[PDB]
């Protein structure tokens, strides 16, 4: 038994070498911040959810406020993100009210460890 996840898909997280076909069947949501990504998400990530008909689990968001509203309303157990892709050098204080487990990591092994259990 695994945990439910809300994954925020910045450039760095898209880069992670994750075989997404194995996780598409699970209760995972991919929120895509188009305000901090240049084009569409990596095609092969998109393709892996389609092969199972779980393409609905990827949600594109035009603004961060709306992205975070999705996080609260979706209310999954785990919130994986990486703030380094949003600051030139933030997670609203709310989120702890709706989510149980926040992994906000820079390190690759951490990000993979959580998303693969």
């Amino acid at each position: 038994a695994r945990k439910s996840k809300c994954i925020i898909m910045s450039k760095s997280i898209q880069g992670l070498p994750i075989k997404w076909e194995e996780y598409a069947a699970d209760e995972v949501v991919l929120l895509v911040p188009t305000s901090h990504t240049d084009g569409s998400m990596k095609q092969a990530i998109g393709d892996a959810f389609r092969k199972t008909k779980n393409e609905h689990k990827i949600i594109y968001c035009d603004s961060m406020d709306g992205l975070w509203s999705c996080v609260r309303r979706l209310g999954k157990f785990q919130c994986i993100l990486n703030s380094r892709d949003f600051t030139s050098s933030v997670v609203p204080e709310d989120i702890g009210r709706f989510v149980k487990f926040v992994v906000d990591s820079d390190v690759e092994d951490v990000l993979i460890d959580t998303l693969c259990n």
Binding site: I58, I59, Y60, C61, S69, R73
Partner: protein
């Protein structure tokens, strides 16, 4: 009362059966909008149920919704109590858990006895294509629409409606 509530709901009961029988879009304005509208237990005419189909050009497309309608003893002076089923939709003007619907026409300030169920269910359907900005029961899905992030609104509802089938 029951003298007047019963006579009036019985009149409507005949209209509803007449109206929803025909496929002719003249005598039935509710083709593919109100799929069905009937009393839950035929013996007890105070509890009705309805299946609607979400309007086109919305995240509610190609999905049905079941609506609970309670008619009070004071009908048609007082409006009915209309609600969705628990955890059946994500809509700004709808408290998803309780299924409560905040629809203007059902307030004592704006209710006219001349309005009937098919109109009331129709207004609920109309709510899905035309959300209200004023004050949401789902302040979160409400916040998404105020910030004009439609991609987010389009996807999260489609996520909700899709994951409701599996």
């Amino acid at each position: 009362m029951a003298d007047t509530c019963m006579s009036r709901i019985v009149k409507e009961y005949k209209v509803i059966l007449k109206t929803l029988a025909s496929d002719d879009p003249i005598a039935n304005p509710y083709r593919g909008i109100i799929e069905s509208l009937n009393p839950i237990d035929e013996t007890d005419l105070s509890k009705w149920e309805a299946i609607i189909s979400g309007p086109s050009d919305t995240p509610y497309e190609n999905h049905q919704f079941r609506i609970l309608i309670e008619v009070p003893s004071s009908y048609p002076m007082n409006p009915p109590k209309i609600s969705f089923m628990q955890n059946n939709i994500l809509h700004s003007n709808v408290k998803s858990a309780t299924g409560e619907i905040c629809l203007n026409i059902l307030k004592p300030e704006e209710w006219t006895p001349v309005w009937d169920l098919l109109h009331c269910v129709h207004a609920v359907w109309r709510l899905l294509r035309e959300p209200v900005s004023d004050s949401p029961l789902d302040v979160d899905i409400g916040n998404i629409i105020r910030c004009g992030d439609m991609s987010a609104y389009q996807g999260i509802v489609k996520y909700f409606l899709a994951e409701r089938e599996r």
